[PDB]
From a paper:
OATP1B1, encoded by SLCO1B1 and formerly known as SLC21A6, LST-1, OATP-C, or OATP2, is specifically expressed on the basolateral membrane of hepatocytes. OATP1B1 plays a vital role in mediating the uptake of endogenous compounds such as bile acids, bilirubin, steroid conjugates, and thyroid hormones, as well as a large variety of clinical drugs including statins, antibiotics, antivirals, and anticancer medications for hepatic clearance. The overall architecture of OATP1B1 is composed of the transmembrane domain (TMD) and extracellular loops (ELs) with both N- and C-terminal ends situated in the cytoplasm.
Structures of OATP1B1 bound with bilirubin, simeprevir and DCF, adopt similar outward-open conformations as that of OATP1B1-apo. The root mean square deviation between OATP1B1-apo and each of the ligand-bound states is 0.51 Å (apo vs bilirubin), 0.46 Å (apo vs simeprevir), and 0.89 Å (apo vs DCF), respectively. Additionally, multiple hydrophobic residues act as barriers, blocking the intracellular central pathway. Particularly, the ICH is attached to the C-terminus of TM2 through hydrophobic interactions between F325 and aromatic residues, F83, Y86 and F87. This attachment potentially contributes to the sealing and maintenance of the intracellular gate in the outward state.
Numbering used by the authors: 25 to 123, 137 to 144, 154 to 279, 323 to 651
The structure:
Amino acid sequence: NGLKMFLAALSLSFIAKTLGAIIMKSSIIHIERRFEISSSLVGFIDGSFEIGNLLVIVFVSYFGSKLHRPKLIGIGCFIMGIGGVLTALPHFFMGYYRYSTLSTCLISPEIVGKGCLKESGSYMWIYVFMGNMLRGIGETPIVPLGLSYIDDFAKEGHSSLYLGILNAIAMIGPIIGFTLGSLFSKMYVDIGYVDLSTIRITPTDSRWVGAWWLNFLVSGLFSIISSIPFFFLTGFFQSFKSILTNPLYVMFVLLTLLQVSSYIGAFTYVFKYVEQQYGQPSSKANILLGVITIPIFASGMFLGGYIIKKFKLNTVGIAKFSCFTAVMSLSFYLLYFFILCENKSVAGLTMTYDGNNPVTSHRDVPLSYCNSDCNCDESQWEPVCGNNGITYISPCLAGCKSSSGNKKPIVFYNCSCLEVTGLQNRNYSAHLGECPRDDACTRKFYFFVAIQVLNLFFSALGGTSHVMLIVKIVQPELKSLALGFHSMVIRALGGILAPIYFGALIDTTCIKWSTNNCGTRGSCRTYNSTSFSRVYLGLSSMLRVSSLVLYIILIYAMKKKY
Ligand SMILES: *[C@@H]1O[C@H](CO)[C@@H](O[C@@H]2O[C@H](CO)[C@@H](O)[C@H](O)[C@H]2NC(C)=O)[C@H](O)[C@H]1NC(C)=O
Ligand SMILES: *[C@@H]1O[C@H](CO)[C@@H](O)[C@H](O)[C@H]1NC(C)=O
C-alpha cells in the first residue's frame, strides 16, 4: 500500500472534518432554543470556529511543514474530536429543559435577561465558545499539511488522482451529516435520562431543541478514532513576503478568491432562488437536489483527477484546463439570465388591493374600500391566495369576512377584496399560502435544475485543479504555506464575506420587510422577482466574468514565463 496508508487516514480525517462543518450547521438553529442564548451570540458562536481555524492557519501551515507531517495532522484530528466532545459537555453538567391569528376583516430583553440572570458568574455559553473554536484549530492542519505530504510524496501525476479521490470521498461527510443529524434531531436532548413518554414538545414544535450533545459526540468520537492511524504513519516573515511577492501566485489567489466568493454566494443563495423566482418552497427541492448533487459532484471531482493524470497535463496545460472549466461554468450562467420569470402579484406591495393597477412604491399603498373598514394589522405576513390569482398580505387585508377555522380546509370566505367586477355569479374564497407561480416557470424550473446540475458537474471537474495548480506555481519547499495562506484567503475574505455582501445587495431588493421586535427589518417577507434575480445573477456573473479576465492574464503570464 505504501502511500495509500496515509491516503486512507487522510480520507478518514477529511470525512471527520467535513462532517464537523455540517454538524454544527445542523445544530446551530437547534442550539439557540435550549441554551436560551442570544441570536447575536449564536452567530458569535459560529464565529468561534472561524477564529480558531482562520487565526492560526498561517502559522500551523508554515511551521508544521518542517516538522513530521504524518504525526501533526493526527494531533489536529485529536484536537477536532476533543473540541467536539468538550462542546457536548454542558449537557452532562446542566439540567433538564424545563421550558389562531385568523386575521380576517373586522368592523427579547427578557430572553437576554434569562441568558444573563442564570449566569451566576459563569454561564454555559462560554463552554460552547471555548470548545467549538477548538475544532477550528483541529481543522487547521488537515488541508495545508496533509496535501503537502501526498503532493510531495506521490507519482508523477497521480497526485491529481489521489486529490480527486480524497475530495470525492469527503463528500460522504455530508451524506452522514444528513442521515444521523436529522435522525438525532428526532431524538430528545435528554434521551436516556428522562422518560420520553412525558415530553410534550414534538420535533415540529418550536420549543423542541435538537440533541446537540449526541451530535457533537458522533463527531468527536469519529475524529478521535480517525486520529489513531495517523500516529503510526525569523524565517516566517520572509516566506510570507516571498509567496506574496510571487506575481503568478497573487493573481491566482485573487482569482480564486473572486471565483469561490461567487460560487459560495451561489451555493448559499440557491434555496432563496428556488423559492422566490420559481416557487418551490425548497423543502422538496433540497432533498431532490441533494440526492442528485452528491454523486454528481463526487463524479466531477473524480473525473478531474483522472483527466489530469491520464492526459499528463503540465502547469500551463492545467491552467488552460482550469480556464476551460471557467469558461464552461460561466457560459452556463449566461443561460440563467434568459430563464427569469415575471413578478408575483402581491396586493398592497406590487399591485393595488382591487388588483386594477401595478404599484411603483410599496410605501403607503392606501387601503381600498374593500379593505378600508377592516381594522387590519398591516404588518402581519399571513399570505392567502385568492381565486383571482392574486396573493394578499393577510385574510383581513383580502376583506375575508369569515375563515374556515382550525379545521383542515384553508379557505377564507366572503373576501371583500379580489371580487371580480362583472362576475358576481362566482363566489370568492382564498386558500392559505402564497399563489403558485405560472406554469411556464414551473416547466422552466426543471430546466434550471438541469443546467444547474450541469454547471455543478463542470465546476467540480475543475475542483481538483484549484489546489493542484497552486503547488506547482509555488517554490518546491513553501508548499504547505501556500495551501495555508490560500485556504485562509478562500475562507477569511471570501467564505466569511460571501453571505455578508451577497446578502446586502439581495436585501435592498425586498418589496416587504418583517418587523421583528424593535428591528423593523428582521427578515424579508418577499424578494422582488425581477430585481432579486437581476442582482443576484448579475453579481455572480460579474464576479465570474472578472475571474475569466484574470485567467487570461494568468495564462498569458505563464506562457510568457515558460
Ligand atoms: C357571503 O355573504 C352573504 C351576504 O351577507 C351571505 O348571505 C346570507 O348568509 C346567511 C346563511 O346563508 C343567511 O343570512 C342567508 O341565507 C344569506 N342571505 C342573506 C343575504 O341573508 C352568505 O352566506 C356569505 N357566504 C357566502 C356567500 O359564501
Ligand atoms: C359557492 O359556489 C359553489 C359552486 O360553484 C358551491 O358549491 C358552494 O357551496 C358555494 N358557497 C357559498 C356559500 O358561496
